[PDB]
Structure formats: C-alpha cells, structure tokens
Amino acid sequence: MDKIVVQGGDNRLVGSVTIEGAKNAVLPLLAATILASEGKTVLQNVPILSDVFIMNQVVGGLNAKVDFDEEAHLVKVDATGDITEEAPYKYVSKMRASIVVLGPILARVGHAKVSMPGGCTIGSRPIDLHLKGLEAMGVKISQTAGYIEAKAERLHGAHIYMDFPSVGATQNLMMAATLADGVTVIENAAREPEIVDLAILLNEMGAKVKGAGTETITITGVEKLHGTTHNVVQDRIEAGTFMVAAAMTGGDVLIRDAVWEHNRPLIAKLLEMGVEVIEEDEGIRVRSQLENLKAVHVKTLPHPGFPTDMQAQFTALMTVAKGESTMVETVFENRFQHLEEMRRMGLHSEIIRDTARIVGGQPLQGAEVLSTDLRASAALILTGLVAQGETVVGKLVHLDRGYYGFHEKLAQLGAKIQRIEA
Ligand SMILES: C=C(O[C@H]1[C@H](O)[C@@H](CO)O[C@H](OP(=O)(O)OP(=O)(O)OC[C@H]2O[C@@H](n3ccc(=O)[nH]c3=O)[C@H](O)[C@@H]2O)[C@@H]1NC(C)=O)C(=O)O
Ligand SMILES: *[C@](C)(OP(=O)(O)O)C(=O)O
Numbered sequence: 001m002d003k004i005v006v007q008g009g010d011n012r013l014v015g016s017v018t019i020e021g022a023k024n025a026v027l028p029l030l031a032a033t034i035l036a037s038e039g040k041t042v043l044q045n046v047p048i049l050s051d052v053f054i055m056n057q058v059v060g061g062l063n064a065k066v067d068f069d070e071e072a073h074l075v076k077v078d079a080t081g082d083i084t085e086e087a088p089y090k091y092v093s094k095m096r097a098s099i100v101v102l103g104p105i106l107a108r109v110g111h112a113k114v115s116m117p118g119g120c121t122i123g124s125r126p127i128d129l130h131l132k133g134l135e136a137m138g139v140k141i142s143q144t145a146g147y148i149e150a151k152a153e154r155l156h157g158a159h160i161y162m163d164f165p166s167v168g169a170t171q172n173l174m175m176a177a178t179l180a181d182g183v184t185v186i187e188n189a190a191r192e193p194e195i196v197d198l199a200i201l202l203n204e205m206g207a208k209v210k211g212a213g214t215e216t217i218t219i220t221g222v223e224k225l226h227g228t229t230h231n232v233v234q235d236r237i238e239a240g241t242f243m244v245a246a247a248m249t250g251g252d253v254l255i256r257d258a259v260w261e262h263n264r265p266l267i268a269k270l271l272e273m274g275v276e277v278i279e280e281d282e283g284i285r286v287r288s289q290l291e292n293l294k295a296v297h298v299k300t301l302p303h304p305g306f307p308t309d310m311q312a313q314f315t316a317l318m319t320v321a322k323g324e325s326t327m328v329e330t331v332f333e334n335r336f337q338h339l340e341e342m343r344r345m346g347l348h349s350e351i352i353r354d355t356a357r358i359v360g361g362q363p364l365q366g367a368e369v370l371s372t373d374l375r376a377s378a379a380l381i382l383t384g385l386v387a388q389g390e391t392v393v394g395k396l397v398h399l400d401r402g403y404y405g406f407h408e409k410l411a412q413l414g415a416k417i418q419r420i421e422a
C-alpha cells in the first residue's frame with residue numbers, strides 16, 4: 001500500500017495545526033448511540049479514520065442506522081428500531097475495541113453475542129474486568145464457539161471494585177449501567193478524558209452518570225435514553241504528537257484549541273526536558289531550542305499519569321535530548337516494537353522487559369521501516385524528520401487507524417514529507 005517518505009534533517013516545524021476529534025472518544029461515543037431508543041444522536045468533530053468506519057459497521061450491524069457525513073465530520077445515528085444482539089468476528093477480529101458495544105447492547109436488548117477478542121501484538125489484553133463487572137450486574141456469561149454470549153434477566157446495579165482502571169471495562173460498565181435497574185458504583189474507575197467525554201454524552205442523553213474523571217463513578221439507571229448532539233473532544237494524543245514533533249525539530253508550533261488539562265504529564269515532561277510550552281488564547285504553543293533538551297525519566301501510568309499512547313512518540317524525542325533517557329511502559333507488555341525498527345536507522349537502545357534506555361544524540365540515518373501499530377507508526381515518522389537521509393515508512397494501515405492527514409499537517413509546518421502510492 002502507500003508509503004510515507006521523509007527527507008531527514010532540517011525539518012524545523014513552524015506554524016499552526018488543527019487537531020481532529022479523538023478517535024478513542026468517538027469509538028465509545030458511537031457505542032453509546034445504541035442506548036437511545038428515542039430521537040437521534042449526532043456526533044460532531046468525527047475524524048475520518050479506519051477505526052471509525054469499523055465502529056460504524058458494528059453499530060450498523062445492530063440495526064441502528066448510522067450516517068457518516070465525512071466532509072461535515074458528522075455521524076448521525078437512529079437507534080429507535082429494534083436493536084439486535086451481534087458484534088461479529090469479522091469486525092472484532094480487526095479491532096478489539098469493538099467489544100465496547102457489549103455494555104450498551106445489554107442495556108438496550110438484555111442479551112448480547114460479542115466475538116471474543118483474540119491476540120494483539122502490543123500485549124496480553126484480557127477482558128476479565130469487563131466480564132466480572134457485568135456478572136455483578138446480573139449478566140450470565142457463557143463462551144460459545146468463539147462468542148461471548150451474555151444474557152441479563154434483570155440488568156441491575158452493583159458495587160464493582162476494579163483491580164485495574166481499565167478504560168474499556170469502565171466504558172462498558174458505565175454504558176450498561178445507564179439502563180440498569182439500580183445504582184452502579186465503579187471503584188478504581190478509568191479517569192481518562194475520554195471517560196469524561198462519554199459521561200457528558202450519556203448525561204445529555206438523559207442518563208445519571210456522576211464522578212467521571214475521579215476514581216469512583218456512580219450511575220443511577222433510568223428507563224430510557226434519548227438522542228442529543230455532541231461535539232467530540234479534541235484528540236489529545238494527536239495534539240501531544242505535534243507537541244513532540246515541535247520539540248524534536250527545534251520548532252515553534254501552535255496546537256489549536258489544545259486542552260492543557262488533557263496533556264498535563266506530557267507537558268510536565270516536555271517542560272522538565274527544557275522545552276517551552278505556553279498556553280495562549282488560540283491554543284498551546286510549543287517552542288524548542290534543540291541544544292537545551294535534556295534526558296528524562298518517564299513511566300507510563302493510567303490517567304492522570306503519563307499516557308501509554310504518547311510513549312512511542314516520546315521515545316523518538318528521547319533520541320534527540322542530551323543524556324540517557326529512560327522509558328518505563330507499565331500499561332502494555334509489548335509496546336517497544338518501534339525501537340526494533342529504529343535499530344534500522346542506527347538507534348541503539350537497551351530494553352530490560354518494561355524499561356527502555358535511550359542515550360540521546362546518536363547519529364541516525366534514514367531507512368526503510370515498517371509500522372507495527374498505530375502510535376509506533378507516528379514515532380517512526382517523527383524519527384524520520386531528524387534522521388539524516390531518506391526514511392520510508394510502510395504498513396500505513398496502522399497509521400490510518402488514528403491519524404488523519406499526518407503527512408499533510410507536517411508538510412504544512414515545513415517538513416519534507418510526502419505520502420506516495422507504492
Ligand atoms: C492502542 C489504542 O488505545 C488504547 C489505549 O492505549 C488504552 C490505555 O490508555 O486504552 C484503550 O484501550 P483499552 O480500553 O484496551 O485499555 P485498558 O482496558 O485500559 O487496558 C490497559 C491494561 O489493563 C489491562 N486489562 C484491561 C482490561 C481487563 O479486563 N483486564 C486487564 O488486565 C490490559 O491488559 C491492559 O494492559 C485505548 N483504545 C481505545 C479504543 O480506547 C488504540 O488506539 O487502538
Ligand atoms: C492489536 C493492536 O489489537 P487491535 O488491532 O486493536 O484489535 C493487534 O491486533 O495487534
């Protein structure tokens with residue numbers, strides 16, 4: 001398929017950039033549209049990404065009518081018909097995030113048939129927390145011929161203690177709870193900004209979701225939900241990716257309408273490294289003097305800690321700072337695959353299980369590399385900007401899941417980058 005070609009060196013990024021709506025907010029927000037038995041749900045600021053198309057097919061497969069106006073970045077959903085129960089293998093096998101329809105299907109229909117996710121390269125990714133939480137709400141779970149078969153005679157409230165603050169599990173449980181009979185309390189809940197945005201939509205739909213953004217979410221079930229119009233929160237990871245890009249290239253970039261609160265730990269690490277990050281009326285400005293960049297230690301953690309979704313991109317920045325940086329990835333077990341590819345560009349890194357050491361200032365060269373996953377793809381492209389020579393980034397299927405027009409936005413900021421058909 002396509003390749004991204006980058007002429008490395010002298011790619012100082014200067015200018016302004018517009019950021020898309022959050023891919024990881026839109027996926028669960030689309031799942032939530034299934035809950036509205038009256039009216040229509042309209043999502044605004046929807047990015048054009050392959051994961052969105054898949055989620056639209058999943059929701060559509062449940063007899064909800066989904067109309068995606070790409071140019072207007074609008075998704076309109078009519079879920080007033082009789083909603084069906086199945087999230088098939090053909091979708092779940094291409095995007096394990098599809099299982100966030102499990103909760104809302106159970107809330108609306110009382111039974112669900114959702115394909116069990118298999119293997120994913122970035123880590124083990126079990127869903128025990130989803131199922132255990134659902135069982136506490138009165139859901140009877142079986143596994144039949146590859147499908148999670150779930151039935152709720154009387155979906156009800158429960159006091160759920162999460163072993164880990166799973167984003168996906170918190171979303172499924174929140175959504176299931178909106179139409180349950182009783183009060184659901186999710187302790188040690190995911191606190192991510194996408195959780196907050198989901199709660200905002202649900203409440204505007206007539207739900208009673210409280211404490212989103214805190215360690216405890218309380219949902220009081222109601223009989224039905226209605227349609228509403230919701231502006232999808234800005235993609236903090238795309239925003240953070242451009243902040244990192246500006247930093248690595250000694251740039252001066254304004255990330256339009258960026259939310260400071262959604263990138264606190266990234267910004268704190270950029271500041272500690274020696275980058276300037278300034279809040280202005282029109283957005284967040286990142287300015288960098290390359291010679292002042294100093295190595296840092298980073299440990300990924302559940303929000304409000306440093307996001308795993310900024311890890312790969314941040315390791316690219318670590319290649320340019322002075323000294324030995326350390327990246328500790330605690331969220332996923334196998335999310336340093338991009339460093340294997342970066343070895344092809346001359347980058348030496350020392351990986352001891354969850355810890356990667358990267359000495360800054362190594363002389364990197366352009367090379368043909370292959371994306372291993374969404375954020376890794378971005379990290380390779382960013383590295384191509386600062387390496388000497390031409391970098392060719394392939395397996396863009398991964399990139400297209402979460403970045404829209406990445407090459408175009410970078411080119412508009414001054415980078416020598418193109419997307420060519422191979
Ligand atoms: C990589 C992606 O984004 C990811 C993002 O990295 C992570 C963490 O912030 O949260 C979402 O995944 P997710 O919902 O599977 O993440 P979580 O459930 O929080 O998983 C975090 C960790 O908890 C563990 N976990 C999760 C659920 C569970 O039942 N048991 C369990 O042990 C997982 O193995 C994982 O190692 C994003 N995906 C979406 C669609 O929201 C992507 O864009 O495809
Ligand atoms: C991982 C990335 O899971 P997903 O594609 O999101 O279902 C994989 O398939 O390697």
Ligand SMILES: [Mg+2]
Nearest residue numbers: 093094095120
């Ligand atoms: Mg996959």
